[PDB]
Symmetry: C3
Subunit: 456 residues, 3 copies
């Protein structure tokens, strides 16, 4: 009598169904223990962590997080790890929930071009993080080597309408947030736990806009929530909703009716959500600068009838979500590609600036640049802008306060500095503004902003 | 059948009673669902975050945290948000516990001089954070835009003798801890989660000394504990006591008999305390440098009979609480004002130095400067001090070790450096010491300390 | 009727049995309340925080964490604190679980050479942190002044086969991780919560290798887990296993069947582990850079029969644990001593480099330097190494990529930079490699690495 003692494996071996985020393999739907064969392949590959920002990820199965594994408590798992011949590093795995030293690390050590296997019985029901366990472990985990394995209870989880896979991670780029180009891993930021990005599913906007999760009013949604870390603890929160329940790993304790829950580094939870009114529900790390300054936001979008007795308000918009209220920011991807190619047009910059202007600028100056007479000066046919377009660069970088006059109206207010914006973002935003609302046109270049940022 | 389905509103509309911290509105004390009208006004205003340190807070209702809202599960809330015409920024609100996208953010968007409303049914019982949800959200939250809303269970919470409102926040000033003057918000420290202050209720000493919470031996105290963040998770702890219970948001789980509990960023809990012996109980973030180096301490002061069989010890003092054992440090406020005015007297400095000397210096050199023969040299009629008063500045900033002689007694010990003290604090402490215990008198200036700090 | 109201003390006074980590005093094994006399002495002393790295710890009872205290709920504790005459600082104590202001702080204030006492009834059952409460509190806690006190329930905890004492802390050295020499406390890193070390029981390798905790297959292990902080929250995790249960302080909630659990700063928990298969189980802070870059790993080593049906895999090794897979790194201690003495031999460096080569280098280049043809170039009789031994220093510090040829085989791969290695570590590793596998011999000095690190 160990736990998860259900018998020796019966029937034929089952090849495990591994899914890519944000999807989950189907419930095993069986009453007997099985020998489950898992084949997982490590791939090292460049992917976009943000628009026009590439990163060399180390992946289980080509994604961050890695492929989702689903087995049944009592199963015997024969775990095959392949390391693709293109890999430069060796890799291995530690699966939380494994009973044995290293969670499989020693026996799963796998050089590029090789394959390893070890076998384990899944004694422990629950949701568990797996990750690479190769020195230096922090580097392998920071580069994206984590995912979830579910060990079902023998009777399976209660049925829901949808099951999704969401995994938080902290990332450490040499360059700053949204600085374009291929970004190396930064060991110094990693050791200090100062990530440049905090993401769901390996990228900014991975689960926003046209990539949101979906359900309908009345449906139940189970989310398998991982925190791969490596270093951060998530104040994991759903905006505008509540979790019916939150259960950590294989724990006996189940919390019900909470909105904010702490997920340890390396931790995992199953949360349940019941859709009650339509609109966009935001999954965040409520350490707010992560959610709103580093990418740590995901969307569950609910379709169906409004319930005015429950909520009279409008759908989420750019005031809260900023530039992620849109379907995508693919104009920024295209403008960055054109810059690298030396083929950047005015229109490339305009469309990029339009994407970034949302929230960042429109919260005060409005979508149409009209502002609000006497409170927020207009950017639309702005005489003050026209009178010295170049100074707009200083205003964005270093802010503006004091008495000014715009389209012959008096303002005495404060525009905070926005120095975190990269040279290309300032250039594109300002090029957008100059080419909108009958402004004079022309363009601002990243190089122009670089020169101004460097002026003391 | 949604939750909190108690009927349509009955009776007349109720104007919500909003309280300022640390007080709470009274229990709604009713058996029927109501239409509750809430009017909350945003005010941007300078307040003292520390003695002689001003900060431009963004507030719900003129305080940090913002006004406390109390309604009943099943109530229909008509939420009016006004943004005062003096505001420079637009603002809005996201109330945790609201069922709907953004927790009210889109419909509550409110320019300076304007008013917005949206309606929501309070389906979810519990204690919930609300906060501003205006891009850039981290900035609005960092500037103080958070508070708590309680949704009572339909039968109301159990009666206690006292209900208080305590909310932790992390703050990001350009200047260092206790550097005097009007301190701007520092976006860089905020993004990096490196706060200069960690406070309860928007200021150092907000809940210490003459501003402590009160109760008596035998009474029960309920505290509504918020963490507005934006970024920090509180290792929330009561020194010298225990919580009878800790309940997060609307959760079904209630923890009992704990002293230390983790509150997520954006999280809230109700804690219960039973006073058993008199004295000062300290609420801290037990990430100790926050509690003892950044302001994260609050006091619950208990009156009544000593129980020597339970505790024989003395009341908290300056050894633990340092300069917050006193009623206030208002001498520091007055000395800083006089400096700005150019009217700083020797006595202004003396009284300021006396406030700061407690804990900081008195732990070793004693309240009376006598020290302890052969262990801690005296500052009282100190020949070593008199022999070169100027060098006292180097001793405070950079510490002192090695063999010295003072009032013809031998010392060979270590005075740690105290370089975190600002120029004005060193000047005032040393001016206090020179004017006490028959020392030679004179004064040390901030400018003198500035010159020494700059010497290599 | 207060809690823990079991009567007045009966029988003779009991002198409390205090143990040194990782051991625990025996169960009190009694059915009556007692007067328990505790005598705890503060000692300030240099100890090795890492091999060849000394730190001036401030200790309760000569260890970090301090001596373990065990009493029974309902006991009257007469607490004597002595501060050894060698101390330079005054000290005192705050015991979590004490009912009274400061947890004993005011009455336990104790100058060097003095003794204090206060009395308290242990009303609250549970595991509790104690720590020093002397301004500046963060400094005293950072220097090691914490431990655990257990208050047993009146019937005692359930019997287990083993009880161990593990306490996490964050430490703040002026120098970087593994920089040799006597390291001062760094107030700036402490205030910023940027520790250089994160340790169990006051040192790197305190609970690894020949110092691992032990049990056998089938036995139950209770671990009293403290987090003294001062600042960090532990994502406390056991690699390759599960906790049967996790109970915080005196809480009524008990979590069962979890692998990862958040321990607040100043928090404590009792965890239970049932050994099911042999090998090394790693206790970590799963904020991974702490566990793998700063020292936050401890071992529970299980003896007994392999269960191939549960786990087919091999024992933990250097791939995961790196240089802590070995019994000790005492060659590094000896090489550092010899350097300070000016008697550093080639063999001293070789044996030190051999200790550090494990994981750090062997994960790719193998234990025998053979590498893996076409993937990892060999260090064994390496023509590329021999061709310019000096350049090996640049390769270690700054990494190597691009097409190279070694023992006439083509490589085009990436060796990451390893700039975190100190001058002495690079020197010793390279001296080890030059003196192994028929390489040319010679030696590299710390001074050689210093010059290269400084080259731009
Ligand atoms: C509200 C917090 C604002 C955000 C976000 C942005 N701007 Fe702004 N801007 C704002 C104020 C209150 C003022 C007037 C400052 C004063 O001294 O009273 C401004 C000013 C400008 C100007 C110059 C005036 C004009 O042409 O109307 C420009 C060109 C401008 N702002 C542009 C701008 C851009 C491009 C932004 C996004 C990057 C942006 N602003 C944000 C208030 C706020
Ligand atoms: C205990 C940790 C101390 C605190 C806090 C402060 N001081 Fe100190 N001081 C201390 C020691 C052990 C010594 C002797 C150092 C040695 O080499 O043995 C000192 C020395 C001084 C002196 C010079 C000697 C004298 O005049 O008595 C001065 C002027 C002094 N200390 C002042 C001082 C002030 C103003 C402090 C608060 C800012 C302070 N000290 C803190 C021990 C400790
Ligand atoms: C895998 C991540 C590695 C670790 C850890 C270390 N090394 Fe390495 N090394 C590696 C590769 C893929 C290469 C070839 C780089 C290329 O451009 O293809 C290297 C190269 C070296 C060399 C030069 C070649 C040789 O002599 O074989 C030396 C001297 C070397 N490496 C030494 C070295 C030492 C001492 C390490 C621990 C500090 C170490 N390496 C780690 C891959 C990896
Ligand atoms: Cu890997
Ligand atoms: Cu892990
Ligand atoms: Cu706001
Ligand atoms: Cu929120
Ligand atoms: Cu101490
Ligand atoms: Cu404490």
């Amino acid at each position: 009598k160990l736990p998860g003692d259900f018998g020796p494996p019966r029937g034929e071996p089952i090849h495990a169904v591994l899914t890519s985020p944000p999807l989950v393999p189907p419930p095993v739907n069986r009453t007997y223990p099985a020998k489950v064969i898992v084949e997982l392949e490590v791939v090292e590959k460049e992917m976009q962590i943000s628009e026009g920002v590439s990163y060399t990820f180390w992946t289980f199965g080509g994604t961050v997080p890695g492929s989702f594994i689903r087995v049944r408590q009592g199963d015997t798992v024969e775990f095959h790890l392949k390391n693709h011949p293109s890999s430069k590093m060796p890799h291995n795995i530690d699966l939380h929930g494994v009973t044995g030293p290293g969670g499989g690390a020693a026996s799963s050590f796998t050089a590029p071009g090789h394959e390893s296997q070890f076998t384990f019985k899944a004694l422990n029901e629950g949701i568990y993080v797996y990750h690479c366990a190769t020195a230096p472990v922090g580097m392998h985990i920071a580069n994206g080597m984590y995912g979830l394995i579910l060990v079902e209870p023998p009777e399976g989880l209660p049925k829901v309408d949808h099951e999704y896979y969401v995994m938080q991670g902290d990332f450490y780029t040499a360059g700053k947030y949204r600085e374009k180009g291929l970004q190396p891993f930064d060991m110094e930021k990693a050791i200090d736990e100062r990530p440049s990005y905090v993401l769901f599913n390996g990228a900014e906007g991975a689960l926003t806009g046209d990539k949101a999760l979906h359900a309908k009013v009345g449906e139940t949604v189970r989310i398998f929530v991982g925190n791969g870390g490596p270093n951060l603890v998530s104040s994991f929160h759903v905006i505008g909703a509540i979790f019916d329940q939150v259960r950590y790993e294989g724990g006996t304790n189940v919390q019900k009716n909470v909105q904010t829950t702490l997920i340890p580094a390396g931790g995992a939870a199953v949360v349940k959500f019941t859709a009650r009114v339509p609109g966009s529900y935001v999954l965040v790390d409520h350490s707010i600068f992560r959610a709103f300054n580093k990418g740590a936001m995901a969307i569950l979008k609910i379709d169906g009838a409004e319930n005015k007795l429950v909520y009279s308000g409008k759908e989420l918009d750019m005031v809260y979500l900023g530039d992620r209220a849109a379907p995508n920011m693919s104009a920024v991807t295209k403008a960055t590609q054109a810059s690298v190619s030396g083929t950047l047009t005015v229109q490339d910059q305009v469309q990029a600036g339009r994407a970034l202007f949302a929230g960042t600028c429109s919260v005060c100056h409005q979508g149409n640049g009209a502002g609000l007479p006497g409170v927020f000066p207009p950017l639309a046919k702005s005489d003050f802008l026209a009178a010295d377009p170049k100074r707009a660069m200083n205003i964005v970088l270093h802010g503006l306060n004091g008495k000014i006059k715009v389209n012959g109206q008096e303002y005495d207010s404060v525009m905070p500095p926005m120095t975190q914006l990269n040279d290309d973002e300032v250039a594109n935003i300002l090029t957008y503004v100059l080419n909108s609302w009958d402004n004079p046109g022309g363009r601002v270049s990243a190089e122009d902003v670089k020169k101004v940022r460097a002026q003391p």
